[PDB]
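Holo model, 3PE. Inputs:
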Amino acid sequence: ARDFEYNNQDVNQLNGAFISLVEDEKIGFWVGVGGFAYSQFIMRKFVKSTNIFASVTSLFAGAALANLYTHQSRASYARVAARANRNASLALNKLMEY
Amino acid sequence: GFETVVPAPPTRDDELRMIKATEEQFLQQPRYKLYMNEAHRIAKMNHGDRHNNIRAHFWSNFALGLLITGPIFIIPFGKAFRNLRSGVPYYFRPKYVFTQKNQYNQDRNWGAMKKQIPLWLGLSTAYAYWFTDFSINDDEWLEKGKVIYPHQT
Amino acid sequence: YKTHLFSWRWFLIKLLPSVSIILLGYYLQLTLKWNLFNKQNTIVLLITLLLLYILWLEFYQFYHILSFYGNINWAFDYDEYIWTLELDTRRTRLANNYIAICLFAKFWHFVFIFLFWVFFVLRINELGRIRYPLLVANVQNFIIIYIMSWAYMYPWLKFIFRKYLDVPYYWFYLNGRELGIRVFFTDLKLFFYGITNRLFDFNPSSIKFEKYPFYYWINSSQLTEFNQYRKFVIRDSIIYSLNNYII
Amino acid sequence: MDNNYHFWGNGDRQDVSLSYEDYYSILDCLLDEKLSPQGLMKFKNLHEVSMYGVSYVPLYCFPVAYGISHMLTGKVRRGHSGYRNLFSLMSVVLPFTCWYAYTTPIPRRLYTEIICSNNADGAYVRNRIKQQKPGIWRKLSQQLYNKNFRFPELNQDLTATEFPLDYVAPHKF
Amino acid sequence: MEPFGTDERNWTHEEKDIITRFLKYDKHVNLKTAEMVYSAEVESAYFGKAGALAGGVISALFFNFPIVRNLPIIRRSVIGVLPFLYCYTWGKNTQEELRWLKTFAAYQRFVVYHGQHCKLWV
Amino acid sequence: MIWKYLQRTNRGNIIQAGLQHRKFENLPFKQNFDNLTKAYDLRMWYISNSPHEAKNLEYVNELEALHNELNYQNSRQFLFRTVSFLLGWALFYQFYELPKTYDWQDTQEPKHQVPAYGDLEEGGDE
Amino acid sequence: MILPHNNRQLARQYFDSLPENDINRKYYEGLKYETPKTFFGRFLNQFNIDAKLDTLSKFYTYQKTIRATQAELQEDRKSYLTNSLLFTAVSWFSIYQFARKGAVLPVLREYGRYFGTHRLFRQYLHTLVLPLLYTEYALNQKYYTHMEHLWTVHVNRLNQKILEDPLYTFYPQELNVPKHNIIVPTIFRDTPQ
Amino acid sequence: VYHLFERICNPDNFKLSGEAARVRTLIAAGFSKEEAEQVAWLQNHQVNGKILGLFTGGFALYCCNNYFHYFERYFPRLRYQPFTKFLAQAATVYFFFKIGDYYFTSRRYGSNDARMNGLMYSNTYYSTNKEALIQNFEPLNRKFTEEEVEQFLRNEGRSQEEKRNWIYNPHIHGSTEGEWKADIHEKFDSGKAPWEREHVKAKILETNKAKIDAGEEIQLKPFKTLNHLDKTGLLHRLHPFIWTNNWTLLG
Ligand SMILES: CCCCCCCCCCCCCCCCCC(=O)OC[C@H](COP(=O)([O-])OCC(O)COP(=O)([O-])OC[C@@H](COC(=O)CCCCCCCCCCCCCCCCC)OC(=O)CCCCCCCCCCCCCCCCC)OC(=O)CCCCCCCCCCCCCCCCC
Ligand SMILES: CCCCCCCCCCCCCCCCCC(=O)OC[C@H](COP(=O)([O-])OCC(O)COP(=O)([O-])OC[C@@H](COC(=O)CCCCCCCCCCCCCCCCC)OC(=O)CCCCCCCCCCCCCCCCC)OC(=O)CCCCCCCCCCCCCCCCC
Ligand SMILES: CCCCCCCCCCCCCCCCCC(=O)OC[C@H](COP(=O)([O-])OCC(O)COP(=O)([O-])OC[C@@H](COC(=O)CCCCCCCCCCCCCCCCC)OC(=O)CCCCCCCCCCCCCCCCC)OC(=O)CCCCCCCCCCCCCCCCC
Ligand SMILES: CCCCCCCCCCCCCCCCCC(=O)OC[C@H](COP(=O)([O-])OCC[N+](C)(C)C)OC(=O)CCCCCCCCCCCCCCCCC
Ligand SMILES: CCCCCCCCCCCCCCCCCC(=O)OC[C@H](COP(=O)([O-])OCC[N+](C)(C)C)OC(=O)CCCCCCCCCCCCCCCCC
Ligand SMILES: CCCCCCCCCCCCCCCCCC(=O)OC[C@H](COP(=O)([O-])OCC[N+](C)(C)C)OC(=O)CCCCCCCCCCCCCCCCC
Ligand SMILES: CCCCCCCCCCCCCCCCCC(=O)OC[C@H](COP(=O)([O-])OCC[N+](C)(C)C)OC(=O)CCCCCCCCCCCCCCCCC
Ligand SMILES: COC1=C(OC)C(=O)C(C/C=C(/C)CC/C=C(\C)CC/C=C(\C)CC/C=C(\C)CC/C=C(\C)CC/C=C(\C)CC/C=C(/C)CCC=C(C)C)=C(C)C1=O
Ligand SMILES: CCCCCCCCCCCCCCCCCC(=O)OC[C@H](COP(=O)(O)OCCN)OC(=O)CCCCCCCCCCCCCCCCC
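Output:
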């Protein structure tokens, strides 16, 4: 049976964005792990603080580093997906309006 | 594609209504906007309005880029003219005119300016083109060239 | 479709000797301040030999161009079973004739500068030393002839600047788009990404079959569809015959 | 990530990348009668972009060639005095930089739309490139397979009942 | 009637031999094209041996040249055979170049005659 | 505090730059292009910014010799680099397989090689 | 390209001639082939390239792609083998001459740890063995993906039970059908219209 | 670093954010442009009370924080327990929050009079919209049938600006010309929804027999939020405020 067909242009753009975003996500996860390790090493060696505070700071530093690395692909995919979802919703509403 | 139903020829009352609509559109046409009476007059005016909106956005972005890139790129870039690559401070190197530059740092300041101003303008226009959106007046399939008559509006 | 585009990969190798000559001339000019006539005879003779080589190449090309206009062919008279030589005129696109005239002018100019160089070398040999006026005059003659050597590359300029001419006026409302500067700033980014991907991302391999003959003469079939040029039926038949002969 | 991702002439990092030389070669083995009006419009837009892009490529390559020519001349910057040698030697250096740039493929939304379209026009262009331009199609198919595009024309098709017509380069399964 | 572009494969020796034999002995070709190929062959056969003979003579002279003669045999023979190698390779290269250029012109004529080029018509 | 970063200019952006001491602290023992050009720049700046006539004229005399020496060094550099570039170009084109499989449609003019109009070109006469 | 009635089904003939218990028989019955995904599996499969090529040649002889692959692989084997032999000969000659003159490259230990073999002998052994291993590895990497794709196509054909000769198959002259060159145009008749 | 610079210096960061964010989010979710606007209005009205209460509590704390210190005369617990003072401040903030929430979200029923409708004296518009939505909202508990899907696909090019000229080709439509014209008029010209056709309803009942046996009612018509939400109140026959409108509703 026939079914709603999405726009090929949007499909291709989303495919490219998704590939880039997956590659980023992976590399950025590794970068975040490395940044957490480095922040923990620095805190335990040069910073006079409690272990809980040092660990929290290291976790936040790693998360921030990963987000900085992966923001470009995440933002690009977010905007492309938002546009595609808006277009699909408008088309489906126009089709099913009664 | 499919064809719509063709209405029967208009009556005199319909003709009068169309004439009144065309008169109203002509009156609404701005005085300072010079567009010739043609089938594409309304399409051209809409295109011009969209282009004016894009122009406004582009010039705002260009002004913002001139404001921002200055302290960030051009001014630090001018720190490279403090000394030559040999380590000696900047001194004038004439080409054919041995201009007298007795004024303090005249040579260094002018040499830095000659490269900073073009760099400033280039970076500002790059910022404008990067952060300005042309979506409003972009037509990939050129479907906005359809003629719109004054009475239809 | 007659665009007349010549390959730059072929043009650069042909252009090499002239730039070599001009660079050697500049080096001789610069070194004349602290060098003697006997030592610089090496550079003078190298320049002379390079100029002779370029003169031979120019003469060969000029001879080919001038001999084009004489159309000589062999016609087989079957009644006498004899081949006979026949001469006829030529018909071709006038652009070819115009560029032939331009190349004739280039050849005459190169002969002139070659005679100039011969005169200069003979005079310096007689005098016993080189002089800046004549040396620099010869160097600038070499530079000018190098500039003129690009005469037959006008098709690229036409190919670039005819698509700008064919663009209609913006307000005639044919397409309502102007993307010059936009395309410039977008192509900056596109080239940046392309270069980064080329030198850091996946690059498809260039390996190919180098031994099997006529391997890449792909005849039409279900895999390649049948949307080829209509008269490629003969090409497909010839490919089939060649494959049969190979096997 | 510029603010004009909608623009057809624009491109993305992971979009299909095609060289200018490859595009001009592909233009040779195509017929307009066999393309739908939408495909013809796509090709016309692509030419509209390429008209400016090709002319701008040497502009992009100019600074690199200028620097290379200066380095070849030496470590002395003599301004107008050295223009003759700079531009006589740069007349061959800049062509090399333009050669590298043109051989470098660049992504483009129009390129990906034309090549990877799942319609009759896409199939026609892919088959024509496969048949009349095997050398270009080999690289194009390698790129598509690496970017997770599946078509019957690809040499890397693992679900095909017919043998490939070209050498299959090594890749990860 | 073959792929065009930088990524394509240059003509192979076997392909050139097959094409020239086809032009020589095929029925679909025209008498003028066949005559062109035959003239190419006959007029190119000379250089292959002319270059070899010139190289032999030059190498015979260079063996007894002022310095080569006094050089030891290991250096003498190697240095004296260089002109022969250069002339022989030049002769073979020019023979092949002339023959292949004229055969390719004949192939172009055949393609135009049979209308096998997608962008050529009257 | 936006003014403290926008309207406040660094002292180096206004006051004349000094001499980069690290550039001369340690130098090679070779009278090479680097040392020659360093001395040339030093003398040139001193001539530009000094009011002492006795030292400038001798500085001019020394600077002429420095210019000659730098010209010699540049000549050597130009020779070496140009020869290397030419040899590399020649070797690249010797070992590079030049594509000899380009389209030859341009060289063919079917309507011109065999005159399509035949005898109608000469006068007509119909 | 070959019409069904013009197809000689040489692949089907070979399949019939094959034995009862065969991997091709199992594939025809419906056994599915999946390329190894682990490093150990790929390393094991690296040595099966020759057998796969031989069986594919036996099945689809006269196939254009298979014939081209065979020719290219044979030429590559010859070229790599001769290059390796030349490299080994040159290295051995150089080592012998320099050892005669008293110069030995300071590579490898002077004496063996277990048998006390001399550095010269071990250098000869390495020069002989290493290039052969490198040649084998290079050829296997070059041809592994191509061989796997060809084998996957063959297995898919067997599973679908398509034993007819594939596309781009050119039989010899004996099996090539003659072309009828006798054509008699129909008698001309004035159109009634 | 180029992307980081872009993020920092994007002009959108300086540009003030608008109210279109909710509409865009709802459109991406699936609501139509009008439905998105109505839902965004409802959500904004619901949250405005809380935002205003928080702002009022903050302003009250800022202006009259000394009241907590003054109260120590009667409640020395504030003086001798700063934690108690902090809890009292939090309680005051929550009190303002709840007052605002009551003002903007509580039913606060009032008369439907044009003289005071929309003045916020009563939360009539919000109350009526919420009641209508909650009462008439019933998710479609079916699966769209093949006929409905085909009609939705066929509705790609339909437009009410100009009626389509339907042409009967026997070789692709079958049946008779009159029957085909009647069916086409029913499907498209009449505007009748696909689920309102008798055979479509029968197929729906046959396919959902299990739900019917379990006792669950099948909703033929999917919920239309724009048919029950109207920020202006015209749908619910709420009289517009006189001084901001130049027309009257009968009621
Ligand atoms: C040197 C020292 C340093 C100081 C100086 C700075 C450096 C030197 C250059 C400065 C002067 C540049 C020219 C004037 C531009 C501004 C004019 C103006 O203010 O009037 C309003 C006028 C109209 O503005 P608008 O209608 O609002 O358009 C903006 C909208 O956003 C819409 O945007 P859009 O993208 O749609 O573009 C709009 C435009 C787009 O139009 C086009 O498409 C034209 C360009 C097409 C592409 C290029 C083709 C030609 C080059 C081919 C190269 C081939 C190479 C060879 C290849 C093969 C061989 C290797 O079309 C129009 O709007 C219609 C008018 C087109 C006029 C174009 C001709 C302008 C020059 C002539 C008049 C002025 C006198 C100039 C004197 C000489 C200056 C050197 O401005 C424009 O021309 C458009 C905006 C241009 C960008 C901003 C420029 C800011 C100024 C600083 C720029 C610094 C340099 C970096 C950028 C490169 C130059 C642009
Ligand atoms: C597929 C087979 C291919 C065969 C190709 C042909 C060449 C290899 C086989 C040749 C055999 C006949 C040679 C002539 C014999 C003449 C008589 C004689 O005196 O011998 C000459 C001479 C020994 O005489 P020598 O005077 O005593 O000299 C001793 C010097 O230390 C030796 O010093 P060196 O100057 O020779 O230098 C040390 C040696 C490097 O030797 C090492 O010590 C490197 C060790 C690397 C270990 C890496 C991790 C291994 C992890 C476990 C793997 C398990 C097996 C996995 C199998 C996977 C599927 C294939 O070479 C180098 O470092 C330079 C070459 C660069 C490395 C390339 C090596 C490629 C080997 C390919 C064949 C491998 C066959 C494995 C068989 C199964 C083994 C279980 O033999 C050789 O030079 C051939 C050595 C072959 C490899 C020996 C490996 C021993 C360590 C095994 C560890 C694992 C098992 C431990 C078991 C413990 C008890 C339960
Ligand atoms: C935020 C949104 C912004 C939107 C955009 C706005 C843009 C700006 C546009 C502004 C345009 C102006 C709008 C003004 C609206 C005013 C309200 C309105 O429309 O009412 C019309 C009002 C309609 O009210 P209604 O008839 O009750 O109908 C029900 C309502 O429709 C609806 O009733 P309901 O269902 O809601 O509730 C039923 C009932 C339920 O409620 C009750 O029962 C409440 C009962 C107590 C009253 C309210 C609390 C009072 C608390 C004590 C006082 C304040 C304490 C704090 C301060 C200290 C004070 C000492 O309420 C009533 O009984 C309503 C009676 C009206 C008075 C109470 C209304 C609240 C007054 C708030 C005053 C403070 C706010 C500022 C001033 C007003 C706004 C400008 O029309 C009249 O009643 C006028 C009829 C006139 C007939 C002709 C008279 C001829 C003259 C005869 C006497 C001559 C005397 C001469 C003396 C000479 C002596 C020498
Ligand atoms: C007297 C005046 C004479 C003027 C004649 C010279 C005009 C030069 C015009 C240059 C235009 C270049 C357009 C290139 C378009 C390429 C399109 C394409 O697909 O790319 C594949 C290109 C062309 O490849 P191809 O030519 O092998 O393509 C094969 C296909 N056919 C057969 C159709 C040609 O790839 C290359 O090989 C790279 C070529 C780059 C050439 C760039 C030259 C730019 C100009 C440099 C001048 C320097 C002078 C010094 C001073 C400079 C400052 C002023
Ligand atoms: C072998 C060792 C013993 C000692 C050898 C001594 C070297 C002898 C060099 C002789 C040089 C002759 C110069 C002829 C100039 C005229 C050329 C001409 O008109 O072209 C005709 C023919 C060309 O005719 P053509 O028309 O077939 O051109 C072919 C064109 N291409 C290359 C595109 C296929 O010349 C040649 O074949 C080559 C000419 C090269 C010219 C180079 C000039 C500068 C360098 C000269 C050599 C310097 C060597 C110094 C010693 C080095 C020792 C290590
Ligand atoms: C078929 C092929 C072509 C056939 C035609 C034959 C063409 C023959 C061309 C010969 C050219 C010879 C040029 C010699 C120049 C000598 C200059 C001189 O006197 O030295 C001044 C001086 C010589 O200086 P000096 O360096 O010798 O010494 C100066 C004195 N000291 C050193 C003490 C300070 O040079 C200069 O001033 C430098 C610039 C020279 C510019 C020369 C321009 C010549 C223009 C010639 C035009 C010819 C037109 C021909 C028309 C067609 C004819 C058919
Ligand atoms: C143990 C020995 C210690 C020795 C001392 C020296 C130690 C040096 C350690 C270096 C660690 C480097 C870690 C890099 C982590 C990158 C994370 C990441 O993805 O970020 C990408 C981002 C950019 O992201 P993006 O989105 O633009 O793109 C990232 C790349 N792609 C596009 C592929 C996704 O880069 C950063 O902003 C990183 C830096 C963050 C801020 C901290 C900077 C600290 C150093 C500042 C020095 C300034 C000196 C003065 C400069 C003056 C200039 C005029
Ligand atoms: C795809 O990516 C993108 C694009 O495409 C590429 C874009 O176009 C754009 C468009 C927008 C843009 C703003 C363009 C961005 C362009 C960029 C970043 C490139 C241009 C960058 C520049 C011009 C900056 C160059 C300047 C510098 C590096 C600063 C140099 C400073 C130096 C050398 C300092 C030297 C000073 C000293 C040593 C101090 C000396 C002091 C002394 C006292 C002297 C010594 C004295 C004594 C006594 C010792 C975007 C946003 C983008 O993301
Ligand atoms: C979450 C669980 C964990 C525990 C936390 C529980 C939180 C409960 C809810 C919020 C409670 C808020 C009150 C907190 C304690 C009291 C804070 C306070 O001191 O506020 C009064 C203070 C008066 O100012 P004062 O410094 O005394 O100046 C006198 C000048 N003569 O004025 C102020 O300093 C202003 C206080 C404002 C309080 C919030 C009001 C709501 C709106 C806030 C808008 C955003 C404010 C951002 C402030 C950023 C500051 C860096």
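Residues B 69, 73, 76-77, 79-80, 82-83, 119, 123, 126-127, 130; C 188-189, 192; F 12, 17-21; H 2, 6 surround Ubiquinone-8 (ligand 8) (CB under 6 Å). Chain F touches chain D through ten residues (CB under 8 Å).
Archived with the compound record.
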